[PDB]
C-alpha cells in the first residue's frame, strides 16, 4: 500500500482524493506499486519475467511468449486494470482497488476538489476539499495541484534535477 513515506523507485508520488500512487518517469512502467522499470518491447526467452507494461510481465507458454497482466488485473485497451474496477465508472477520477477490504471491491478516487458522492453511486461529483498530505522535502519543492492531482513541484520562483 502506497503511503506518504513511499519511495517510488524511478518515479514520483501523486495524490488523489482517496489514495496515493507512483507515476513513472518518461516511458517507464510500473513493475509493482512502488517501482518503475523499463518495459520490454517484445517478450522472448531472454526477457522472461520482465515488465512489459503497468502490472504485466512476460510469461512463457508451453513454445511462445506473451505479455499478460498480473493476477487480479484485466486488460482494457492494452493497459492492466484491476478486476473489480472493470465495470466501475467514476467520472472525475479513476477506479482503484480497496486493498484493506475483506471482499474484493472497487472504489472511486477523485481528482482534487471532488469526493465520492454517496447520492450518485459513489461517483466523483460531490465537491470536497482534499488536503495535500505529500511531504515535498526536495530543494525548493512544494505540493502543487497539477491537472487535478497533487504532486511535488518547484515553488513560486524556482523551476526545473534540482529546482532553481
Amino acid at each position, epitope marked *: 500500500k502506497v503511503t506518504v513515506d513511499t519511495v517510488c523507485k524511478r518515479g514520483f508520488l501523486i495524490q488523489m*482524493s*482517496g489514495h496515493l500512487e507512483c507515476k513513472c518517469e518518461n516511458d517507464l512502467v510500473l513493475v509493482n506499486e512502488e517501482t518503475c522499470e523499463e518495459k520490454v518491447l517484445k517478450c522472448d526467452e531472454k526477457t522472461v519475467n520482465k515488465p512489459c507494461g503497468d502490472f504485466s510481465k512476460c510469461i512463457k507458454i508451453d513454445v511462445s511468449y506473451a505479455c499478460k497482466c498480473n493476477l487480479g488485473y484485466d486488460m482494457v485497451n492494452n493497459v492492466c486494470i484491476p*478486476n*473489480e474496477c*472493470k*465495470q*466501475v*465508472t467514476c467520472g472525475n477520477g479513476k477506479c482503484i482497488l*480497496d486493498t*484493506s*477490504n*475483506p*471482499v*474484493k*471491491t*472497487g*472504489v472511486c478516487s477523485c481528482n482534487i476538489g471532488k*469526493v*465520492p458522492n*454517496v*447520492q450518485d*453511486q*459513489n461517483k466523483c461529483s460531490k465537491d470536497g476539499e482534499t488536503k495535500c498530505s505529500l511531504k515535498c522535502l526536495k530543494e525548493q519543492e512544494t505540493c502543487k495541484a497539477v491537472d487535478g492531482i497533487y504532486k511535488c513541484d518547484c515553488k513560486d520562483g524556482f523551476i526545473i534535477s534540482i529546482c532553481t
Partner: antibody
Amino acid sequence: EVQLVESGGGLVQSGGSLRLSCAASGFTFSRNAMNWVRQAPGKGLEWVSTISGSGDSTYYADSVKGRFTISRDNSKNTLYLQVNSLRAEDTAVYYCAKGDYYFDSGSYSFGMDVWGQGTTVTVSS
Amino acid sequence: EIVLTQSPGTLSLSPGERATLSCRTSQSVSSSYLAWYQQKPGQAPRLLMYGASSRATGIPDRFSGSGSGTDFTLTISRLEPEDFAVYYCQQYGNSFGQGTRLEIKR
C-alpha cells in the same frame, strides 16, 4: 430509488433444495458487492455469504459452506442463493443487502445500507 | 471468521438517557469495516454507521459511533421511544455480533 425484492422461500422437506433470488433495481448492479443475511426465529442476524461486484470473488460463512452457493447475473441485476440438503436449522428469514461505502474524512467506510424485505424458508416434514 | 462480542446483553434505560453499546472483536479490524445496524421487531435491519463512525443517510445525529482496534462503541444520547430496538455490529464480509437489546425502563 434503490430496490431489492426477494423470492424463492416456502416450505420444503428436510434435506431438500431451494433457490433464493433477489431482484435489484435503481442502481448499477455490477459495481456493488451483494450479501445474504439470515435470521432464525427468535435469534439474531447471521451473515451467510458475500459476492463481489463482478462475481469472481465469493465469501461464505463456516455454517453454510458446502451446502449454500451464492452467485449473481449482472445481465439481469439478480442475486441468487442456491442450497442443497437443507438442515432443520436453516429455517430463517433470508435478507439480501447491497454492500457499498461512504467516503468520510479520508477513509472508505463500508456497510450494508440497502436491504430487501426478506423471504422466509421453512424446513420441516 | 472473527468473533464479535456485544455488551451488555439487555440494556434497560429510560427515554432521555444516554445509551452506550459495546462491540469487541476477537481480533483487530480496520474501523472502516465494522458497521452498526438497527432492527425493529418485525422489520428489516437498517444500517446505522458506515464503518465505525460515519452516520448513514437518515440516521439522527444523536447516534454516534467510535472505536479502534478491538473496541468499538455505539453511543445513543437523548434516547427517544423510536430508538429502543436491537442493535448489531458486523465485520464487513464476516460475522455479526450477538446483538444488544434496548428496552424501556419504567
